[PDB]
Design an enzyme around this catalytic site. Structure first.
Site, short mmCIF file in Angstrom:
data_model
loop_
_atom_site.label_atom_id
_atom_site.label_comp_id
_atom_site.label_asym_id
_atom_site.label_seq_id
_atom_site.Cartn_x
_atom_site.Cartn_y
_atom_site.Cartn_z
N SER A 132 19.09 -21.67 15.40
CA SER A 132 18.53 -22.82 14.71
C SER A 132 17.11 -22.60 14.19
O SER A 132 16.69 -23.27 13.27
CB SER A 132 18.57 -24.04 15.63
OG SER A 132 19.92 -24.40 15.91
N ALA A 133 16.38 -21.65 14.76
CA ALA A 133 15.02 -21.38 14.30
C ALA A 133 14.94 -20.88 12.86
O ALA A 133 13.85 -20.93 12.26
CB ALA A 133 14.32 -20.43 15.25
#
EC number: 3.4.16.4
Length: 315
Positions: free
Chosen positions: A61-62
Protein backbone atom coordinates in the site's frame (compact mmCIF):
# COMPACT_ATOMS: atom_id res chain seq x y z
CA UNK A 1 30.12 15.83 9.03
CA UNK A 2 27.60 12.98 9.08
CA UNK A 3 23.87 13.76 8.83
CA UNK A 4 23.15 11.17 11.55
CA UNK A 5 21.37 12.81 14.47
CA UNK A 6 22.30 10.70 17.48
CA UNK A 7 19.22 11.66 19.54
CA UNK A 8 16.90 10.39 16.76
CA UNK A 9 19.14 7.40 16.13
CA UNK A 10 18.88 6.37 19.79
CA UNK A 11 15.09 6.90 19.76
CA UNK A 12 14.81 4.79 16.58
CA UNK A 13 16.85 1.96 18.11
CA UNK A 14 14.95 1.94 21.39
CA UNK A 15 11.51 1.99 19.76
CA UNK A 16 12.56 -0.53 17.10
CA UNK A 17 13.90 -3.09 19.59
CA UNK A 18 10.83 -2.67 21.86
CA UNK A 19 8.47 -3.29 18.96
CA UNK A 20 10.50 -6.24 17.67
CA UNK A 21 10.41 -7.78 21.21
CA UNK A 22 6.67 -7.42 21.82
CA UNK A 23 5.82 -8.88 18.37
CA UNK A 24 8.45 -11.62 18.60
CA UNK A 25 9.88 -10.73 15.25
CA UNK A 26 12.79 -11.98 13.20
CA UNK A 27 14.15 -8.48 12.50
CA UNK A 28 13.34 -4.89 11.71
CA UNK A 29 14.43 -1.52 10.31
CA UNK A 30 13.78 2.17 10.73
CA UNK A 31 14.74 5.07 8.40
CA UNK A 32 14.30 8.69 9.40
CA UNK A 33 14.90 11.44 6.82
CA UNK A 34 14.79 15.18 6.77
CA UNK A 35 11.70 15.63 4.56
CA UNK A 36 13.03 18.78 2.87
CA UNK A 37 16.74 17.98 2.35
CA UNK A 38 16.89 14.19 2.00
CA UNK A 39 19.42 13.95 4.87
CA UNK A 40 19.43 10.57 6.66
CA UNK A 41 18.82 11.42 10.33
CA UNK A 42 18.52 7.81 11.47
CA UNK A 43 19.09 4.36 10.08
CA UNK A 44 18.51 1.61 12.68
CA UNK A 45 18.63 -2.16 12.13
CA UNK A 46 18.35 -5.15 14.43
CA UNK A 47 21.58 -7.24 14.54
CA UNK A 48 22.89 -8.58 11.22
CA UNK A 49 23.24 -6.73 7.89
CA UNK A 50 22.07 -3.21 7.02
CA UNK A 51 18.57 -4.32 5.87
CA UNK A 52 17.38 -0.73 5.22
CA UNK A 53 19.83 -0.83 2.34
CA UNK A 54 20.21 -4.53 1.39
CA UNK A 55 16.77 -6.13 1.68
CA UNK A 56 14.32 -5.53 -1.18
CA UNK A 57 10.65 -5.60 -0.15
CA UNK A 58 7.34 -5.27 -1.93
CA UNK A 59 5.99 -1.89 -0.87
CA UNK A 60 2.32 -2.86 -0.87
CA UNK A 61 0.00 0.00 0.00
CA UNK A 62 2.93 2.39 0.47
CA UNK A 63 3.14 2.76 -3.35
CA UNK A 64 -0.51 3.80 -3.68
CA UNK A 65 0.00 7.54 -3.14
CA UNK A 66 2.32 7.72 -6.11
CA UNK A 67 -0.20 6.19 -8.51
CA UNK A 68 -2.90 8.57 -7.29
CA UNK A 69 -0.49 11.48 -7.53
CA UNK A 70 0.46 10.54 -11.12
CA UNK A 71 -3.21 10.29 -12.17
CA UNK A 72 -3.96 13.75 -10.71
CA UNK A 73 -0.77 15.29 -12.14
CA UNK A 74 -1.60 13.97 -15.64
CA UNK A 75 -5.23 15.08 -15.30
CA UNK A 76 -6.56 11.54 -15.82
CA UNK A 77 -8.67 12.05 -12.73
CA UNK A 78 -9.61 14.80 -10.26
CA UNK A 79 -11.05 15.28 -6.74
CA UNK A 80 -14.69 15.24 -7.96
CA UNK A 81 -14.62 11.93 -9.80
CA UNK A 82 -16.23 8.89 -8.17
CA UNK A 83 -15.01 5.54 -9.36
CA UNK A 84 -16.88 2.30 -9.37
CA UNK A 85 -14.73 0.29 -6.99
CA UNK A 86 -16.55 -3.05 -7.07
CA UNK A 87 -14.09 -5.97 -7.02
CA UNK A 88 -13.27 -7.34 -10.46
CA UNK A 89 -11.22 -9.87 -12.38
CA UNK A 90 -8.88 -9.65 -15.33
CA UNK A 91 -9.27 -13.06 -16.85
CA UNK A 92 -8.91 -15.52 -13.99
CA UNK A 93 -7.11 -13.11 -11.60
CA UNK A 94 -9.05 -11.07 -9.07
CA UNK A 95 -8.56 -7.53 -7.76
CA UNK A 96 -10.36 -6.68 -4.54
CA UNK A 97 -10.25 -4.43 -1.49
CA UNK A 98 -10.66 -5.44 2.17
CA UNK A 99 -14.37 -4.53 1.88
CA UNK A 100 -16.75 -4.02 -1.02
CA UNK A 101 -16.76 -0.25 -1.53
CA UNK A 102 -19.24 0.22 -4.38
CA UNK A 103 -17.93 3.66 -5.25
CA UNK A 104 -15.22 5.99 -3.89
CA UNK A 105 -13.78 9.36 -4.81
CA UNK A 106 -10.03 9.87 -4.87
CA UNK A 107 -9.99 10.84 -1.21
CA UNK A 108 -11.86 7.61 -0.45
CA UNK A 109 -9.38 5.54 -2.49
CA UNK A 110 -6.49 6.90 -0.39
CA UNK A 111 -8.39 6.76 2.94
CA UNK A 112 -9.61 3.17 2.50
CA UNK A 113 -6.43 2.20 0.67
CA UNK A 114 -8.45 0.70 -2.23
CA UNK A 115 -6.59 -1.77 -4.47
CA UNK A 116 -9.49 -1.55 -6.92
CA UNK A 117 -9.47 2.24 -7.13
CA UNK A 118 -5.70 2.51 -7.34
CA UNK A 119 -5.57 -0.20 -10.04
CA UNK A 120 -8.19 1.55 -12.20
CA UNK A 121 -6.23 4.82 -11.95
CA UNK A 122 -3.03 3.05 -13.01
CA UNK A 123 -4.96 1.46 -15.90
CA UNK A 124 -5.50 4.92 -17.42
CA UNK A 125 -1.77 4.81 -18.30
CA UNK A 126 0.09 2.46 -20.64
CA UNK A 127 2.43 -0.17 -19.27
CA UNK A 128 5.44 1.71 -20.60
CA UNK A 129 4.37 4.96 -18.90
CA UNK A 130 3.96 3.24 -15.54
CA UNK A 131 7.29 1.43 -15.94
CA UNK A 132 9.12 4.71 -16.63
CA UNK A 133 7.30 6.34 -13.64
CA UNK A 134 8.44 3.54 -11.28
CA UNK A 135 12.00 3.77 -12.68
CA UNK A 136 11.93 7.56 -12.17
CA UNK A 137 10.97 7.05 -8.49
CA UNK A 138 14.27 5.14 -8.23
CA UNK A 139 12.79 1.63 -8.31
CA UNK A 140 15.38 -0.70 -9.80
CA UNK A 141 17.97 2.13 -9.56
CA UNK A 142 20.59 1.31 -6.89
CA UNK A 143 21.53 4.04 -4.44
CA UNK A 144 25.31 3.35 -4.41
CA UNK A 145 25.20 4.03 -0.65
CA UNK A 146 28.55 2.21 -0.38
CA UNK A 147 27.34 -0.79 1.63
CA UNK A 148 28.05 -4.40 0.71
CA UNK A 149 25.14 -6.42 -0.70
CA UNK A 150 23.13 -3.33 -1.71
CA UNK A 151 19.94 -4.08 -3.72
CA UNK A 152 19.00 -2.48 -7.06
CA UNK A 153 15.40 -3.63 -6.51
CA UNK A 154 13.10 -5.41 -8.97
CA UNK A 155 11.46 -3.69 -11.95
CA UNK A 156 10.53 -6.09 -14.79
CA UNK A 157 10.66 -4.74 -18.35
CA UNK A 158 7.23 -3.34 -19.36
CA UNK A 159 7.23 -5.48 -22.50
CA UNK A 160 6.89 -8.57 -20.27
CA UNK A 161 3.97 -7.34 -18.09
CA UNK A 162 0.55 -9.09 -18.28
CA UNK A 163 -2.39 -6.66 -17.77
CA UNK A 164 -2.93 -8.18 -14.31
CA UNK A 165 0.75 -7.34 -13.45
CA UNK A 166 0.26 -3.62 -14.05
CA UNK A 167 -2.69 -3.66 -11.67
CA UNK A 168 -0.84 -5.62 -9.01
CA UNK A 169 2.21 -3.28 -9.21
CA UNK A 170 -0.14 -0.28 -8.65
CA UNK A 171 -0.94 -1.68 -5.21
CA UNK A 172 2.69 -2.66 -4.49
CA UNK A 173 3.24 -6.31 -5.45
CA UNK A 174 5.61 -7.58 -8.17
CA UNK A 175 8.13 -4.75 -7.85
CA UNK A 176 10.64 -4.38 -5.06
CA UNK A 177 12.87 -1.78 -3.40
CA UNK A 178 14.80 -1.29 -0.13
CA UNK A 179 13.27 0.62 2.77
CA UNK A 180 15.79 3.36 2.01
CA UNK A 181 14.54 3.56 -1.65
CA UNK A 182 10.95 3.75 -0.41
CA UNK A 183 11.73 6.51 2.12
CA UNK A 184 13.53 8.30 -0.73
CA UNK A 185 10.47 8.12 -2.93
CA UNK A 186 8.40 9.86 -0.25
CA UNK A 187 10.55 12.98 -0.65
CA UNK A 188 8.69 13.58 -3.95
CA UNK A 189 5.54 14.00 -1.85
CA UNK A 190 7.10 15.96 1.04
CA UNK A 191 9.37 18.32 -0.97
CA UNK A 192 6.48 19.65 -3.12
CA UNK A 193 6.89 17.27 -6.08
CA UNK A 194 10.70 17.16 -6.08
CA UNK A 195 12.47 13.84 -5.55
CA UNK A 196 15.73 14.26 -3.57
CA UNK A 197 18.81 12.06 -3.88
CA UNK A 198 19.35 11.42 -0.12
CA UNK A 199 22.65 11.93 1.69
CA UNK A 200 24.66 10.55 4.60
CA UNK A 201 26.35 13.98 4.85
CA UNK A 202 25.06 17.28 6.25
CA UNK A 203 23.69 19.63 3.60
CA UNK A 204 23.69 23.38 4.30
CA UNK A 205 21.07 23.79 1.54
CA UNK A 206 18.68 21.27 -0.05
CA UNK A 207 20.30 19.56 -3.02
CA UNK A 208 19.00 19.82 -6.54
CA UNK A 209 16.50 17.02 -7.00
CA UNK A 210 14.22 16.38 -9.92
CA UNK A 211 10.58 17.14 -10.45
CA UNK A 212 8.17 14.22 -10.53
CA UNK A 213 4.89 16.00 -9.65
CA UNK A 214 3.54 19.51 -9.85
CA UNK A 215 3.77 21.30 -6.50
CA UNK A 216 -0.03 21.64 -6.46
CA UNK A 217 -0.37 17.89 -6.98
CA UNK A 218 2.00 17.06 -4.12
CA UNK A 219 0.27 19.49 -1.75
CA UNK A 220 -3.11 17.98 -2.59
CA UNK A 221 -1.89 14.42 -2.08
CA UNK A 222 -0.38 15.23 1.33
CA UNK A 223 -3.83 16.52 2.36
CA UNK A 224 -5.46 13.30 1.10
CA UNK A 225 -2.92 11.21 3.06
CA UNK A 226 -4.01 12.80 6.36
CA UNK A 227 -7.34 10.95 5.94
CA UNK A 228 -5.30 7.76 6.40
CA UNK A 229 -4.44 8.57 10.01
CA UNK A 230 -7.82 10.10 11.00
CA UNK A 231 -10.86 7.97 12.00
CA UNK A 232 -12.12 6.08 8.92
CA UNK A 233 -8.60 5.57 7.55
CA UNK A 234 -6.53 2.40 7.66
CA UNK A 235 -3.59 4.08 9.50
CA UNK A 236 -5.05 5.49 12.72
CA UNK A 237 -2.35 3.56 14.61
CA UNK A 238 0.22 6.15 13.43
CA UNK A 239 -1.75 9.21 14.57
CA UNK A 240 0.55 11.64 16.50
CA UNK A 241 -0.88 13.95 19.17
CA UNK A 242 -0.60 17.59 18.12
CA UNK A 243 0.04 16.98 14.41
CA UNK A 244 -1.57 16.07 11.11
CA UNK A 245 0.18 12.93 9.80
CA UNK A 246 0.09 11.71 6.20
CA UNK A 247 0.95 8.02 6.11
CA UNK A 248 0.49 4.57 4.58
CA UNK A 249 0.57 1.17 6.12
CA UNK A 250 1.16 -2.16 4.46
CA UNK A 251 1.52 -5.88 4.93
CA UNK A 252 3.36 -8.14 2.50
CA UNK A 253 3.53 -11.95 2.38
CA UNK A 254 6.85 -13.77 1.80
CA UNK A 255 5.04 -15.01 7.35
CA UNK A 256 4.50 -11.29 6.70
CA UNK A 257 6.48 -7.98 6.51
CA UNK A 258 4.66 -5.15 8.33
CA UNK A 259 5.40 -1.59 7.17
CA UNK A 260 4.34 1.92 8.22
CA UNK A 261 5.63 5.04 6.49
CA UNK A 262 4.62 8.67 6.87
CA UNK A 263 5.49 12.30 7.34
CA UNK A 264 4.55 15.29 9.49
CA UNK A 265 3.64 18.06 9.81
CA UNK A 266 1.58 16.94 6.81
CA UNK A 267 1.06 20.42 5.33
CA UNK A 268 4.68 21.51 5.84
CA UNK A 269 6.62 18.28 6.38
CA UNK A 270 9.88 18.07 8.30
CA UNK A 271 10.38 14.36 8.92
CA UNK A 272 9.80 11.09 7.11
CA UNK A 273 9.71 7.99 9.25
CA UNK A 274 9.65 4.49 7.73
CA UNK A 275 9.44 1.31 9.80
CA UNK A 276 9.51 -2.31 8.66
CA UNK A 277 9.01 -5.30 11.04
CA UNK A 278 10.05 -8.63 9.53
CA UNK A 279 7.92 -11.71 10.44
CA UNK A 280 6.03 -10.73 13.57
CA UNK A 281 4.85 -13.92 15.39
CA UNK A 282 2.88 -12.26 18.24
CA UNK A 283 0.20 -9.64 19.01
CA UNK A 284 -0.77 -9.13 15.34
CA UNK A 285 0.84 -9.03 11.93
CA UNK A 286 -0.69 -6.06 10.02
CA UNK A 287 1.38 -2.94 9.29
CA UNK A 288 -1.00 -0.77 11.32
CA UNK A 289 -0.83 -2.83 14.55
CA UNK A 290 2.83 -3.92 14.31
CA UNK A 291 4.61 -0.91 12.76
CA UNK A 292 2.17 1.89 13.60
CA UNK A 293 3.14 2.20 17.30
CA UNK A 294 6.92 2.43 16.77
CA UNK A 295 6.26 4.87 13.91
CA UNK A 296 3.98 6.90 16.20
CA UNK A 297 6.59 7.18 18.99
CA UNK A 298 9.54 7.73 16.64
CA UNK A 299 7.69 10.45 14.71
CA UNK A 300 6.34 12.14 17.87
CA UNK A 301 9.77 12.01 19.49
CA UNK A 302 11.61 13.25 16.37
CA UNK A 303 9.32 16.25 16.07
CA UNK A 304 9.96 17.08 19.72
CA UNK A 305 13.80 16.50 19.43
CA UNK A 306 13.83 18.79 16.36
CA UNK A 307 11.68 21.39 18.13
CA UNK A 308 8.79 21.32 15.67
CA UNK A 309 5.70 22.91 17.21
CA UNK A 310 2.30 21.12 17.33
CA UNK A 311 -0.23 22.42 14.74
CA UNK A 312 -3.31 21.52 16.84
CA UNK A 313 -4.05 21.28 20.59
CA UNK A 314 -2.89 18.20 22.53
CA UNK A 315 -5.70 15.83 23.60
Amino acid sequence: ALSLDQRIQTLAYEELNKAVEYHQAKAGTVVVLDARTGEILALANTPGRNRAVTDMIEPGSAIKPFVIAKALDAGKTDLNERLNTQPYKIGPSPVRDTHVYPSLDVRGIMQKSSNVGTSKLSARFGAEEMYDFYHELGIGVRMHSGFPGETAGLLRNWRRWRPIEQATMSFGYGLQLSLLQLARAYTALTHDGVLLPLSFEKQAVAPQGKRIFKESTAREVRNLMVSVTEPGGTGTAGAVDGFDVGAKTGTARKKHVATFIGFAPAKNPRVIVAVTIDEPTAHGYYGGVVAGPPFKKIMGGSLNILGISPTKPLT
